[PDB]
């Protein structure tokens, strides 16, 4: 059998017995085949419905208990066996099971002892009976329980980012049934940025919260903080969903969505205007975004007809998410909490944003069609259909009840997107996976991302360039090194994926679905330098981490035995020139121009050998994979020699060698050379323009301002005429016009 055999039988008996009572009385016999088709989140709901009409069947109740046993939900599985046993006492084997499970999970309660006594009298002195007697004894005493707790706390003092240890603390709290303390630590720990990124931790967070909601302790205590803990569950769901989608398989991700949707429906009714309501707002967006990402995962593997329909469906999901407004940040109790919520908001807009674009670039105003056709409520049922099995109640599912009102159907603006990315760099702890994705999403766009601003958001007060550039010791790491690194990681990643699909779209993959986009070498380095900088390394591993970084430094700086293809160096050079050429301050201009000249000075020897059609000495285990896809050709050499000579002149100008800089700039009639010629002629004029000074000099001073005006005009004249020149502008066109207005009013 398969999925089709069992879900097609739905229409078989649906067409034979359509009334609700008989439809649910077939649930046990529906669930009979899903247990065989390896569907346990589905089989669970099928049998559970038959139990809603046939609540006195010991077979059905046991079957659910045996299914909750596969789910490892001890509290739920035990209760099911209990019902089957109290209905039918002859089920001896279940009395053993109950006694077996009660002693394995927790012995503190005498209930485990009672069921063990009965299990003994049903199986006199059987081999299992003693086994359970030893198990019940195994559990430690009061002094023993306290002993374990002190270890975890003393262990958590120095290792607060350890996933396993924090999990054990929640389990120890849960073993003493002080769940309030379990959630209390669980809440104070959702502020940890590392734990929030742990798949297994968030899974524990979902359980420990649910356990507390149903727990007797939650009701007795008060209903005031009930809302507070409820927020974390939604937050946990969002994080857990992001992680499950990437690592887990198609089935597990879909199942988590249902838990997400159940929580949303249960939360919307309360509403209000506090942190919980604001949290519901932002998490609502995440739901669709991840749901869209989830949709695209299924279609990737599937055929073309389903792909377009699913991508159409996903496009709507991402759209819904992007539309959702920035959550009300002021409304949260604390600075940490509110800053977190905004961070996630930026993540939502950024991820959904690029997806909305990459899906809309396929066709012309493709977005408009998506809304005009599927914004209809018919789409809401087509979405629930593709995502879930229709058998689940469509009433308590948030997806089916949401009011899809006035979809903006407006593609995102790049400027807004940039500030979303920059604000969300800390969303996923700056995993090189995160950044390499963003960097690639901008690789297809005409505007480039503010990478230098990304790094400033991550490694604060890390100098742009280190004074002690002589050595490769990793205490001298600089934001330039990182910027130069990410450039290669993305330039490398793009080429690798390009080669993959050629053997078999690459931009369209969502962030969770795609696999590692960088080499484990690169990832190890980034994780190392990150742990080092943020001061979350290990005293013992310091020397190792330190050396791991040191190894690659000599390559990021194009020193001895750099594993750098000439094309990657050139890309670094120009990408830094133009990156620096647009900066306002001199410190930054100098640095970025310096590095650009440096890399240039390393390439030109290679280009000369390549200029005569010779062979480049290939590398030994390079850090950045070589590719013949972008191997430099003679057709492009003279351009680089020219483009490099500009970079030389620019640095000469910044250092003071105006005479040599101008002599070079004037040699080549390029759009960029105009903006440089103009910018330096303006400075010689403005300073001398108004001070008391020799009149003849004043006329010469004015003469330069006259040259400035002319060169800016040549820029705009040639710019408006041809589009290719607009892209060559070292700064935006409006910026050129902005100066010109001031230049002439002077």
């Amino acid at each position: 059998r398969s999925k089709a055999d069992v879900e097609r039988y739905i229409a078989s008996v649906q067409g034979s017995t359509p009334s609700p009572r008989q439809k649910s009385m077939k649930g046990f016999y529906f669930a009979k085949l899903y247990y065989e088709a390896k569907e346990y989140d589905l089989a669970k709901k099928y049998i559970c419905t038959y139990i809603n009409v046939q609540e006195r069947d010991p077979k059905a109740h046991r079957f659910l208990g045996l299914l909750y046993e596969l789910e490892e939900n001890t509290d739920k599985a035990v209760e099911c066996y209990r019902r089957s046993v109290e209905l039918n006492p002859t089920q001896k084997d279940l009395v053993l099971k109950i006694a077996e499970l009660l002693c394995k999970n927790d012995v503190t309660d005498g209930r485990a002892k009672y069921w063990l006594e009965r299990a003994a009298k049903l199986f006199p002195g059987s081999p299992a009976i003693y086994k359970l007697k030893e198990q019940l004894l195994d559990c430690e005493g009061e002094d023993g329980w306290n002993k374990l707790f002190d270890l975890i706390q003393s262990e958590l003092y120095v290792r607060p980012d350890d996933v396993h240890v924090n999990i054990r603390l929640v389990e120890v709290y849960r073993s003493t049934k002080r769940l309030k303390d379990a959630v209390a630590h669980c809440h104070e720990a959702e502020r940890n940025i590392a734990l929030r990124s742990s798949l297994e931790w968030n899974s524990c967070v979902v359980q420990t919260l649910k356990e507390y909601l149903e727990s007797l302790q939650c009701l007795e205590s008060d209903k005031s903080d009930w809302r507070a803990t409820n927020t974390d569950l939604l937050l946990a769901y969002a994080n857990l969903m992001l992680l499950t989608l990437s690592t887990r398989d198609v089935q597990e991700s879909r199942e988590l969505l249902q838990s997400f949707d159940s929580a949303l429906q249960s939360v919307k009714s309360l509403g209000g205007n506090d942190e919980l309501s604001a949290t519901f707002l932002e998490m609502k967006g995440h739901f669709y975004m991840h749901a869209g990402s989830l949709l695209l995962k299924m279609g990737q593997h599937s055929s073309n007809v389903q792909w377009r329909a699913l991508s159409e469906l996903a496009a709507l999901c991402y759209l819904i998410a992007f539309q959702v407004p920035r959550p009300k940040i002021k409304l949260i109790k604390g600075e940490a909490g509110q800053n977190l919520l905004e961070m996630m908001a930026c993540d939502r807009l950024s991820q959904s944003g690029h997806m909305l674009l990459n899906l809309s670039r396929g066709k012309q105003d493709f977005l408009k069609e998506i809304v005009e056709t599927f914004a209809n409520k018919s789409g809401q049922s087509a979405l629930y259909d593709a995502l879930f099995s229709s058998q689940s109640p469509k009433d308590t599912s948030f997806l089916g009840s949401d009011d899809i009102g006035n979809i903006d159907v407006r593609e995102p603006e790049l400027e807004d997107l940039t500030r979303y990315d920059v604000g969300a760099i800390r969303a996923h702890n700056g995993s090189l996976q995160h950044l390499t994705w963003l960097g690639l999403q901008w690789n297809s766009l005409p505007a480039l991302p503010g990478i230098r601003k990304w790094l400033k958001q991550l490694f604060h007060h890390l100098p742009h360039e280190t004074s002690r550039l002589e050595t490769n010791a990793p205490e001298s790491i600089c934001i330039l090194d990182l910027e130069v690194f990410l450039l290669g990681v993305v330039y490398t990643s793009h080429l690798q994926l390009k080669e993959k699909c050629n053997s078999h779209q690459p931009l369209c993959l969502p962030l969770p679905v795609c696999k590692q986009l960088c080499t484990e070498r690169q990832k190890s380095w980034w994780d190392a330098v990150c742990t080092l900088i943020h001061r979350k390394a290990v005293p013992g591993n310091v020397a190792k981490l330190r050396l791991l970084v040191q190894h690659e430094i000599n390559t990021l700086r194009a020193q001895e035995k750099h594993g750098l293809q000439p094309a990657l160096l050139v890309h670094w050079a120009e990408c830094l020139q133009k990156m620096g050429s647009g900066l306002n301050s001199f410190y930054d201009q100098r640095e970025y121009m310096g590095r650009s000249v440096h890399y240039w000075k390393k390439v030109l020897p290679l280009l000369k050998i390549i200029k005569k059609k010779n062979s480049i000495p290939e590398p030994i285990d390079p850090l950045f994979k070589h590719f013949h896809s972008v191997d430099i050709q003679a057709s492009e050499i003279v351009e680089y020699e020219e483009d490099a000579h500009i970079t030389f002149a620019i640095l000469d100008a910044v250092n003071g060698n105006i005479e040599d800089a101008v002599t070079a700039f004037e040699s080549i009639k390029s759009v960029v050379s105009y903006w440089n010629l103009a910018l330096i002629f303006h400075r010689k004029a403005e300073d001398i323009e108004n001070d008391a000074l020799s009149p003849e000099e004043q006329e010469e001073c004015k003469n330069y301002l006259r040259k400035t005006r002319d060169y800016l005009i040549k820029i705009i004249d040639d710019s408006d005429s041809n589009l290719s020149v607009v892209k060559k502008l070292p700064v935006p066109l409006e910026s050129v016009k902005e100066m010109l207005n001031s230049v002439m009013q002077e």
Partner: antibody
Amino acid sequence: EVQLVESGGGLVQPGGSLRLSCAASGFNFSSSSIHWVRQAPGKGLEWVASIYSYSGYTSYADSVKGRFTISADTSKNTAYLQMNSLRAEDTAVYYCARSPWRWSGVSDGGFYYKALDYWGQGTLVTVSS
Amino acid sequence: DIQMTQSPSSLSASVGDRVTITCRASQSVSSAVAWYQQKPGKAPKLLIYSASSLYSGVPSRFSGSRSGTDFTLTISSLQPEDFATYYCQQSSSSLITFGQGTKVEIKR
């Protein structure tokens, strides 16, 4: 261009709390170990806290163990000395200082710092009811 | 616990003298000792690190030395600006301890 500035001092009542701030600039705060050293009037130097360079494992003198808490923030490029249950005996001038990773070695049974190169101006803390 | 016993507690000398201060480590300690100069009210400054290595910028008349568990600061020719209090410091496992200090008073 490189300096350490202490702040967050002033007077407080016994059994109260304070928080000192050691703002650093000019050296990569990640690779530096941070220490606090108090000195009562007319008395000598007493080491009270340390933070290993690249990770930040704490270590306090028994005279203040469990009461004080020293921390380091990469984003703010600043270290702090949280002080609780302050006693009249804690009245002293509190200095902070760094020890680069070049001088921070880890050994079986604990770590050692070769010396304290950069020192701060020193912020006064008075504890008297 | 390790203890650095500094001697003498208070010293009196005049300019040009070859002055000596000594600190004894109770337990056998490795060469991870330092020396500091603290002028009245000002901050302590580092003179010698790793027992006998001179901190960059310190005058050449300062020199550190060790013998067994006794560490010794040595000034070849005392100067007027060197009349201040000095301290010795050991760095053992996850612990730092200072000597009681030595005041260098001008003799008359």
